[PDB]
Amino acid sequence: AQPKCNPNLHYWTTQDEGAAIGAAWIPYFGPAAEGIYAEGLMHNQDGLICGLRQ
């Protein structure tokens, strides 16, 4: 399992939910603020994740 180094990713199952990609030059406010910002608490996270451990 992971080494417990993820940010939040509590709104998206787990997969990179805005973990720097945007999948449409939109990682800026794509799945990070495409209505997500409404979270106004933390759901607007990114999703760094070490990937395994580093």
UniProtKB/TrEMBL annotation:
Disulfide bonds join 5-50. It is found in: Host cell membrane; Secreted; Virion membrane. GP1 and GP2delta are part of GP1,2delta soluble complexes released by ectodomain shedding. Interacts with host entry receptor NPC1. Belongs to the filoviruses glycoprotein family. Acts as a class I viral fusion protein. Under the current model, the protein has at least 3 conformational states: pre-fusion native state, pre-hairpin intermediate state, and post-fusion hairpin state. During viral and target cell membrane fusion, the coiled coil regions (heptad repeats) assume a trimer-of-hairpins structure, positioning the fusion peptide in close proximity to the C-terminal region of the ectodomain. The formation of this structure appears to drive apposition and subsequent fusion of viral and target cell membranes. This is Envelope glycoprotein. It comes from Zaire ebolavirus. The gene is GP. The chain holds residues 507 to 560 of 676 of the full protein.
